[PDB]
Amino acid sequence: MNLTELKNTPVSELITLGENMGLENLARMRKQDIIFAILKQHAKSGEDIFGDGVLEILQDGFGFLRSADSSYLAGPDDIYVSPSQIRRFNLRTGDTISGKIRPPKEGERYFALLKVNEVNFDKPENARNKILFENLTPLHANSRLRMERGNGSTEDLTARVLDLASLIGRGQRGLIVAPPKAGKTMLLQNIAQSIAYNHPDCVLMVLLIDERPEEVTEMQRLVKGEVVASTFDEPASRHVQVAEMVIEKAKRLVEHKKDVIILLDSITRLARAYNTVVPASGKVLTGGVDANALHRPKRFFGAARNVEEGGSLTIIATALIDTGSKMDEVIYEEFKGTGNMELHLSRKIAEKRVFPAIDYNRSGTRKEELLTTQEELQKMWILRKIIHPMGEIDAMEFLINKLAMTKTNDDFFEMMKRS
Amino acid sequence: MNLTELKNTPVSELITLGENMGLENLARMRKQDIIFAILKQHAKSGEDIFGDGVLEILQDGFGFLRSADSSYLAGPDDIYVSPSQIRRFNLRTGDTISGKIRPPKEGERYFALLKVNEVNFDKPENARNKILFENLTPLHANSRLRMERGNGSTEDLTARVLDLASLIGRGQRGLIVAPPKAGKTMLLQNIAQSIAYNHPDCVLMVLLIDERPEEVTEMQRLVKGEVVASTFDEPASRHVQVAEMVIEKAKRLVEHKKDVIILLDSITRLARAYNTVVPASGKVLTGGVDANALHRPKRFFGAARNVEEGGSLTIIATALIDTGSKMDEVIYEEFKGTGNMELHLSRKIAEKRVFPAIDYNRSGTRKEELLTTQEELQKMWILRKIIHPMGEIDAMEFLINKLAMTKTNDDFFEMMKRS
Numbered sequence A, B: 001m002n003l004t005e006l007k008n009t010p011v012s013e014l015i016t017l018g019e020n021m022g023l024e025n026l027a028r029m030r031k032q033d034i035i036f037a038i039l040k041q042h043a044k045s046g047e048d049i050f051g052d053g054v055l056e057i058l059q060d061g062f063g064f065l066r067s068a069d070s071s072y073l074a075g076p077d078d079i080y081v082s083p084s085q086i087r088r089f090n091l092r093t094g095d096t097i098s099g100k101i102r103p104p105k106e107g108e109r110y111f112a113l114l115k116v117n118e119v120n121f122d123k124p125e126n127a128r129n130k131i132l133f134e135n136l137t138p139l140h141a142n143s144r145l146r147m148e149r150g151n152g153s154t155e156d157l158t159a160r161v162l163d164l165a166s167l168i169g170r171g172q173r174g175l176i177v178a179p180p181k182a183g184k185t186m187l188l189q190n191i192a193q194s195i196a197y198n199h200p201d202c203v204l205m206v207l208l209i210d211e212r213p214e215e216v217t218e219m220q221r222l223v224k225g226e227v228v229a230s231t232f233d234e235p236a237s238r239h240v241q242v243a244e245m246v247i248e249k250a251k252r253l254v255e256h257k258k259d260v261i262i263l264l265d266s267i268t269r270l271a272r273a274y275n276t277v278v279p280a281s282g283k284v285l286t287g288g289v290d291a292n293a294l295h296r297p298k299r300f301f302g303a304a305r306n307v308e309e310g311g312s313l314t315i316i317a318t319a320l321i322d323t324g325s326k327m328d329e330v331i332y333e334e335f336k337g338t339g340n341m342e343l344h345l346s347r348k349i350a351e352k353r354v355f356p357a358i359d360y361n362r363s364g365t366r367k368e369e370l371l372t373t374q375e376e377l378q379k380m381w382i383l384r385k386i387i388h389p390m391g392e393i394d395a396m397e398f399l400i401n402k403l404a405m406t407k408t409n410d411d412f413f414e415m416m417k418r419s
């Protein structure tokens, strides 16, 4: 009996539990309050129950535990975590905590934590003796993270283009630069699909900032890995809170020699949120951004590394350009040289409805020698040499035609070399 | 026992000492906190405790002492320095201080020092009577700093091309102008390796600004001399204080008739940090960059000189062009006339995968007569007059082809003269 199976289910669970456990009148309140009523009525019986979620530390040890199913909304379903347990188990923000849960006594309205039985999907005894993320020596991307799905579909074409445009490996740090209406959302969809198909072992999690609710629903009903999204309805303070929770959870996961992958849409929106939430430092840059305001997002982008001890943390965040706002241009300029992978999308190609609309010459990755082999390295080199002269629209038309003629990337290289 | 000895040890050993010395949960916190805890527990035992590092003076004499291996980061393990011994010893910023340290008392969190045993690797009385860096009369470069490794390595052609392109001497002010994806980082790496090998006597310092952590790790693991870097995650004040500490330490070392070399990557990033940290003065140049904001970086570049009394301070700083940000080239034409050694890297040569990509015709050195003998100067003049007409890509291809079949620079000279 866990809190998860009573959260993800729809209002059919509401009506069934109302007609079964005999609650007075449900279906007039948020899912958090419905779940609160169900848990209160079930704890009234006294049957043993347990919970799970992601730990969070407030400014004074007021331990909270959020749920990733509900996108980390602060509601009644949040689980109390006492400071005594915090200093006993030595837990910090982002820890995945599951264990026995306690009904509340008089004076409080939150379930506390009876005892833990799983910390970060591991024994709590072994979780304490773990090296910090900040104390891990970074390296370059070693293991190639292939995106070719290999099922011979038609959407996979764009994924194939990725394997020809910019190589992506474990621990990379990439920026997808694109104007509005250029295919960012479907590119992220295809990247998530490729990660779920080719690399089921690595943890995939997608963060969405101030996106429309319809796009959130489309994202959450297609990707395999869990997805967290905050709409533009919520204030930017919640955007910052969600981003901090995501990055802390990723750090905690990668501290256990796990491969974490984060997809962010968008870094510009997160920078906006940080700019409009952080108090002014008295120094305002061009475009209306505070000098310290951009310090926080960079750290979020700075966590991408390839730990030598074990595991890696890859971050692929998209950036908005040509949006008519000078502040977006300032943010992109400040983030221009940070990433080690660049994927440039052009509205000129997308105008002709040729997808994916990737500026092949501008897009690329740095020191990909450590990622891929050498023979296909010069294959891609000669491909780049022959595709360099003609224009980007013609380049993409030629690329998609030649890729559709063949079946796989290796077959594509075979045909290109033999012809 | 040495605080620096503990700092140089890796992260993991915190367990090996801690479980043997009284710490029950020492894994989960920042490394400097472990160092603080262990050295507190050692001061509890009562044996004498050493300390050393670079001194720093605050706005009110509230002095601190940082460590090089920590990249001059303000941490709990920093050594407190009261104004009393500052006044008695006449210490100044950038001093190298070594000696006793004292456990903190009630109301103090930092470790004070009992008495100094060595100042600037010299007796405090002898180091007391030293001349200011400002009062030292500058000169031109006299002692040639040859970069030819001479072991016939697989990369020694880069150093050979460097010697044939721009002669480097002691106390020389150099600029490396290159676009992105040109080869700045490991060109500087080869420079540092050649300095460490050919000239072990001179102190080698490498300074990196807002660089990616992987590059920082590679630089730390590759160069023999000490290297300091601040990643782009850190704010601009961190960059400014790191650069100030480095330049002050270099001045203090060269005040003792020592040769110091500073490799800077990059002066553009340091100028950007100074621009975004210095308060506005009401005069904004093109590209949204203040006027006096460039005052501080030039002083950092203005310390390269050759001294009558002794010692030398060479600075090789790289600059970025063809980036797309207006302030970058604004800084570039705000730095052309300052440097007396120029090294241009071109994108076109790098696009042909021919390395090192050095624009030989545009690069050069002024007042090279005082650095080199007349015979090899005439040989280089003959090479320059036979290399001028053909283009940079062809020039570098020809230079690499001719240098590959020879062994040393002199052999190349006779090979071209006999033809």
Ligand SMILES: Nc1ncnc2c1ncn2[C@@H]1O[C@H](COP(=O)(O)OP(=O)(O)OP(O)(O)=S)[C@@H](O)[C@H]1O
Pocket (backbone or CB within 6 Å): A158, A179, A180, A181, A182, A183, A184, A185, A186, A187, A355, A356
């Ligand atoms: N691989 C693709 N195959 C077919 N159509 C595509 C593909 N990628 C993008 N499109 C089309 O491109 C258009 C825009 O797609 P989106 O990814 O939703 O745009 P966007 O990048 O999210 O930019 P916004 O959200 O409108 S600011 C739609 O008409 C899609 O059908």
Ligand SMILES: Nc1ncnc2c1ncn2[C@@H]1O[C@H](COP(=O)(O)OP(=O)(O)OP(O)(O)=S)[C@@H](O)[C@H]1O
Pocket (backbone or CB within 6 Å): A366, A367, A368, B158, B179, B180, B181, B182, B183, B184, B185, B186, B187, B355, B356, B357
């Ligand atoms: N002498 C050389 N031999 C072989 N490859 C080289 C040589 N010099 C440069 N390269 C290659 O050219 C690229 C230069 O890499 P970097 O030195 O890291 O570039 P950079 O000058 O640091 O500019 P950034 O930091 O990437 S914007 C890499 O792909 C290297 O493999």
Ligand SMILES: [Mg+2]
Pocket (backbone or CB within 6 Å): A184, A185, A215
């Ligand atoms: Mg979209």
Ligand SMILES: [Mg+2]
Pocket (backbone or CB within 6 Å): B184, B185, B215
């Ligand atoms: Mg570099």
